[PDB]
Amino acid sequence: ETLNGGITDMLTELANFEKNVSQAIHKYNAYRKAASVIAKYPHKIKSGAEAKKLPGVGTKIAEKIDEFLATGKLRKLEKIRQDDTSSSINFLTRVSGIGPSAARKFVDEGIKTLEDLRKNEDKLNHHQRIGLKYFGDFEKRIPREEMLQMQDIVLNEVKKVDSEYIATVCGSFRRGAESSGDMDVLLTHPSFTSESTKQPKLLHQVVEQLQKVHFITDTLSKGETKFMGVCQLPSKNDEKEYPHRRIDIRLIPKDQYYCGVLYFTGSDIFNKNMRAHALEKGFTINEYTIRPLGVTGVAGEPLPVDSEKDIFDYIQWKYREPKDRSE
DNA sequence: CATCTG
DNA sequence: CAGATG
Ligand SMILES: Nc1ccn([C@H]2CC[C@@H](COP(=O)(O)OP(=O)(O)OP(=O)(O)O)O2)c(=O)n1
Ligand SMILES: [Mn+2]
Ligand SMILES: [Mn+2]
Ligand code: NA
Ligand code: NA
To answer: How far, in Å, is the CA of A67 from the C1' of nucleotide B1?
Structure first.
């Protein structure tokens, strides 16, 4: 956790680059198990050979660990930090819409910067365009005090459209968090479930409402159940308009709201121990359901949940206020 | 995983 | 349809 921090980190840079610049997934994958093992490892790796000793740790990695331990640095790491090509790919990639794949193409065409991007707005698609338009705003975190106004909004219009809607703002917002990065809304309706055959309108009508009153400004992606957009809190009395914010909205069968709802609330960490404990308590849990684990090895059967309450209970746990879901 | 591009 | 993105 700090004993092998450097090593784990360099390995991480190294891993990252494989995947992003080069396309060495295998190699890339290599750095990752390595870092994961050297991460859990209890002592102070004093050398390469010491590390080699681990699974995941081969000769190459070992070599690296050595040079790194030997001197506060790594050549290859040094060479990568310079190389403008590598840097460019790391940067283009910040644009929502551009991944490595694409980060690669554009570079090979000469688009390496933001400007390049603007000039070549033609080669970009819709999402990327948006991303480009809001690069800045995209990176600003969401101050909790804003979230409240936002939540305040979605929740009223959702209501107006249908009294039966049930929206929940999950995420870190939901977890206490002073600021968050995106707004995720969970959505269900009594009239939408496991079996029931669809009702896309369910998701569409709200989306519309939101843009009706101008809270949603753009559409990144709109499906029958998942919507990815951009939104903004109405600028008050002209002087300080708000940044454009990322927002996702998801339709869920009413029969698996809470699992989902619970689940998005995270944190990853809160998740697992819950999952793990659930496993003890004789269960199973995922994004949509909880299930009584048979003994034959495994087994299913969607336990019936009417709250986050019904869940914990299952696993015979203490109901965790959202804040306390930290880990 | 669900959505988009091409 | 494979392949990309979040
Ligand atoms: N690959 C992933 C990503 C997320 N999650 C969970 C973690 C919380 C939830 C949605 O949260 P995000 O917006 O991804 O993150 P957050 O925890 O809300 O953090 P923030 O919004 O501050 O970035 O999904 C998961 O199980 N697996
Ligand atoms: Mn989030
Ligand atoms: Mn999200
Ligand atoms: Na990106
Ligand atoms: Na293939």
So the answer is: 41
Q: What is the DSSP secondary-structure string of A73-98?
A: --HHHHHHHH-HHHHHHHHHTTSTT-
* Protein CA A126 to sugar C1' B4 (Å): 10
Which structural technique was applied? Answer: X-ray
Q: Which residue has its C-alpha nearest to nucleotide B2's C1'?
A: A226
Domains in chain A: ranges and CATH:
1-83 (1.10.150.110), 84-140 (1.10.150.20), 141-263 (3.30.460.10), 264-326 (3.30.210.10)
- On whether A182 is known to bind a ligand per the annotation, the reply is yes
**Hey, is A102 helix, strand or coil?**
helix
Residue A298: both structure tokens together: 């495994």
The one-letter amino acid at A291: R
A222 touches strand B (CB under 7 A): yes
Instruction: Name the closest ligand to CA A25.
Output: 5
The Cα–Cα gap between A162 and A259 comes to 23
Q: Which ligand is nearest to the CA of A102?
A: 4
Nearest CA residue ID for atom 15, ligand 1? A171
Which are the contacts of A78, defined by CB distance < 8 A and separation ≥ 6?
A: none
* Rounded CA–C1' distance between A166 and B5, in angstroms: 33
* Placement of tokens 């944190």 in the chain: A267
> How far apart, in whole angstroms, are the C-alpha atoms of residue A169 and residue A209?
17
The resolution of the experimental structure, rounded to one decimal in Å, is 2.9
- The answer to whether residue A27 is catalytic is no
Taking the C-alpha atoms of residue A111 and residue A99, their distance in angstroms, rounded to an integer, is 14
Query: Which among A27, A64, A119, A309 is annotated as catalytic?
Result: A64
Q: Which residues contact A74 (CB under 8 A, 6 or more apart)?
A: A10, A14, A64, A67, A68
Q: Which residue matches tokens 């809270």?
A: A215
Closest CA to A18 of A5, A34, A30: A30
Identify whether the C-beta of residue A112 lies closer than 8 Å to the C-beta of residue A92: yes
Asked if residue A99 keeps its beta carbon closer than 7 A to nucleic acid strand B, the reply is no
